[PDB]
Design a protein around this ligand. Structure first.
Ligand SMILES: CNC(=O)CN1CN(c2ccccc2)C2(CCN(C(=O)c3ccc4n[nH]cc4c3)CC2)C1=O
Length: 287
């Protein structure tokens, strides 16, 4: 529907396995947008993956999920258009802030963030996930690296895939197998390969941990990949030897207990996103 000639390409925002994303200016109904196009080395298989992503993205209509603003008309070279999220991925964003020392002592733009803003960030992710659940849409790779930050701490969940070198340490790779974000994965995912809304809740638990850590350390960071995979086996055997992420310094005990529930052995005992969102938006403000 959208004429490609109306785009003015400005800078490269990233590249993935089957496309790359550029910052563009538009003059028509200057707006900035993010535009995904085929890579220069695009193959028949990459174009197929691109077209399928267009179809997947057409499903997703929520304030806290990446939205498809437009696509280029059939004549033109393929493209997808979305909102420009000026503050980049959430992991880099939080890494550049520290928790405020005294409440409301700073100015806008300061490298500090409040505990209630951390809740606001996490609640938005929870709201996005709540939406995906109503679609029976399973994400499979929720993490702060896959969220984007706009103006005024607005958050949108994306899905970059697994090829950014910056996050290569977050994925476990074996020749001929799917690439796996094991440190964010529920035990039943690691052992049995099956991904559900309930395993997305588990990943949300780890993502919430990340947010409260201000992304200062990797989940299970002092443990090897092999040890993390063995931990899943300890969940299975249920002999009380499994281990969990520790309580972040910015996280009160009440919120941490909620976090722990996301990592329940039984999928059905993990809180739904509706419950997670309510806690983050309201209960977590309790003294
Ligand atoms: C929920 N599934 C998805 O979101 C899948 N999708 C679809 N999608 C997309 C991108 C453009 C147009 C249409 C769709 C992306 C968004 C994030 N990506 C970026 O490279 C990126 C980087 C910095 C940015 N700043 N502002 C916006 C930015 C975008 C990877 C591609 C993605 O993960």
């Amino acid at each position: 529907d959208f004429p490609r000639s109306r785009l003015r390409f400005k800078e490269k925002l990233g590249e993935g396995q089957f496309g790359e994303v550029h910052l563009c200016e538009v003059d028509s109904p200057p707006l900035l947008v993010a535009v995904k196009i085929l890579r220069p080395d695009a193959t028949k298989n990459a174009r197929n993956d691109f077209l399928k992503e267009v179809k997947i993205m057409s499903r997703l209509k929520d304030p806290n999920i990446i939205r498809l603003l437009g696509v280029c008309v059939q004549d033109d070279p393929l493209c997808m258009i979305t909102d420009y999220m000026e503050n980049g991925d959430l992991n880099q964003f939080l890494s550049a802030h520290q928790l405020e020392d005294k409440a409301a002592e700073g100015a806008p733009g300061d490298p500090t963030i409040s505990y209630p803003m951390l809740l606001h960030v996490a609640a938005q992710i929870a709201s996005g996930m709540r939406y995906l659940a109503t679609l029976n849409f399973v994400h499979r790779d929720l993490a702060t690296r896959n969220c984007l930050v706009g103006e005024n701490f607005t958050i949108k969940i994306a899905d970059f895939g697994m090829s950014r070198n910056l996050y290569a340490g977050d994925y476990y790779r074996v020749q001929g197998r799917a690439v796996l974000p094991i440190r964010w994965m529920a035990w039943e995912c690691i052992l049995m390969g099956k991904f559900t809304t309930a395993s997305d809740v588990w990943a949300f638990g780890v993502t919430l941990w990340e947010v409260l850590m201000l992304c200062r350390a990797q989940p299970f960071g002092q443990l090897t990949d092999e040890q993390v995979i063995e931990n899943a086996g300890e969940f299975f055997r249920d002999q009380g030897r499994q281990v969990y992420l520790s309580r972040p310094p910015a996280c009160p005990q009440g919120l941490y207990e909620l976090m722990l529930r996301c990592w329940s052995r039984e999928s059905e005992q993990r809180p739904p996103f509706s419950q997670l969102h309510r806690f983050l938006a309201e209960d977590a403000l309790n003294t």
